[PDB]
Protein backbone atom coordinates (compact mmCIF):
# COMPACT_ATOMS: atom_id res chain seq x y z
CA UNK A 1 0.00 0.00 0.00
CA UNK A 2 2.89 2.35 -0.84
CA UNK A 3 3.43 4.25 -4.09
CA UNK A 4 6.96 4.91 -5.37
CA UNK A 5 7.18 8.16 -7.34
CA UNK A 6 10.95 8.71 -7.11
CA UNK A 7 12.65 9.45 -10.44
CA UNK A 8 16.17 8.90 -9.09
CA UNK A 9 18.45 6.83 -11.32
CA UNK A 10 19.32 3.47 -9.78
CA UNK A 11 23.03 3.20 -8.96
CA UNK A 12 24.74 -0.20 -9.03
CA UNK A 13 28.44 0.72 -8.96
CA UNK A 14 30.42 3.40 -7.17
CA UNK A 15 30.19 5.95 -10.00
CA UNK A 16 27.51 8.61 -9.31
CA UNK A 17 24.85 8.62 -12.01
CA UNK A 18 24.39 12.43 -11.70
CA UNK A 19 20.74 12.10 -12.70
CA UNK A 20 21.44 10.33 -16.01
CA UNK A 21 22.04 6.75 -17.10
CA UNK A 22 25.43 5.33 -18.01
CA UNK A 23 27.99 2.94 -16.55
CA UNK A 24 26.27 0.86 -13.83
CA UNK A 25 23.30 3.25 -14.03
CA UNK A 26 19.91 2.28 -15.43
CA UNK A 27 16.48 3.88 -15.66
CA UNK A 28 14.07 2.09 -13.26
CA UNK A 29 11.01 3.19 -15.25
CA UNK A 30 10.07 1.09 -18.28
CA UNK A 31 7.18 1.47 -20.71
CA UNK A 32 4.54 -1.17 -21.38
CA UNK A 33 4.00 -2.92 -24.72
CA UNK A 34 0.19 -2.76 -24.91
CA UNK A 35 -0.83 -3.68 -28.47
CA UNK A 36 -4.09 -5.23 -29.73
CA UNK A 37 -2.45 -7.58 -32.25
CA UNK A 38 -0.37 -9.51 -29.68
CA UNK A 39 -1.10 -12.20 -27.10
CA UNK A 40 -2.15 -12.19 -23.46
CA UNK A 41 1.26 -11.01 -22.25
CA UNK A 42 0.96 -7.72 -24.15
CA UNK A 43 -2.78 -7.40 -23.45
CA UNK A 44 -3.49 -4.67 -20.86
CA UNK A 45 -5.71 -5.61 -17.92
CA UNK A 46 -7.68 -3.27 -15.67
CA UNK A 47 -6.85 -4.39 -12.12
CA UNK A 48 -8.79 -2.83 -9.23
CA UNK A 49 -7.98 -3.84 -5.65
Amino acid sequence: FERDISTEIYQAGNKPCNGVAGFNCYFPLRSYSFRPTYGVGHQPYRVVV
Binding site: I5, S6, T7, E8
Partner: protein
Protein backbone atom coordinates in the same frame (compact mmCIF):
# COMPACT_ATOMS: atom_id res chain seq x y z
CA UNK B 1 13.47 17.88 26.60
CA UNK B 2 13.41 20.97 24.38
CA UNK B 3 12.71 24.44 25.78
CA UNK B 4 11.67 27.50 23.77
CA UNK B 5 11.91 31.01 25.21
CA UNK B 6 15.65 33.48 23.50
CA UNK B 7 15.76 29.81 22.49
CA UNK B 8 14.69 28.51 19.06
CA UNK B 9 14.92 24.70 19.14
CA UNK B 10 13.57 23.20 15.90
CA UNK B 11 15.76 20.15 15.22
CA UNK B 12 15.37 17.43 12.60
CA UNK B 13 15.29 13.87 13.92
CA UNK B 14 14.98 10.56 12.04
CA UNK B 15 11.72 8.61 12.21
CA UNK B 16 12.82 5.02 12.82
CA UNK B 17 9.65 3.95 14.66
CA UNK B 18 6.65 5.50 16.37
CA UNK B 19 7.11 8.65 18.43
CA UNK B 20 5.41 10.14 21.49
CA UNK B 21 4.97 13.92 21.55
CA UNK B 22 4.13 15.63 24.85
CA UNK B 23 3.87 19.42 25.02
CA UNK B 24 3.33 21.61 28.09
CA UNK B 25 2.03 24.45 25.93
CA UNK B 26 0.26 27.71 26.81
CA UNK B 27 -1.83 29.88 24.45
CA UNK B 28 -1.35 27.29 21.65
CA UNK B 29 2.14 28.24 20.48
CA UNK B 30 2.68 24.95 18.62
CA UNK B 31 0.70 24.45 15.41
CA UNK B 32 1.83 21.25 13.70
CA UNK B 33 4.61 18.96 12.55
CA UNK B 34 6.33 17.99 9.30
CA UNK B 35 6.99 14.37 8.29
CA UNK B 36 9.01 13.28 5.27
CA UNK B 37 11.97 11.18 4.21
CA UNK B 38 14.07 14.01 2.74
CA UNK B 39 11.75 17.09 2.87
CA UNK B 40 11.98 18.04 -0.80
CA UNK B 41 10.11 17.77 -4.10
CA UNK B 42 11.74 14.42 -4.94
CA UNK B 43 9.54 12.68 -2.33
CA UNK B 44 6.06 13.01 -0.83
Amino acid sequence: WFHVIKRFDNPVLPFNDGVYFASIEKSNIIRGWIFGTTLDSKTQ
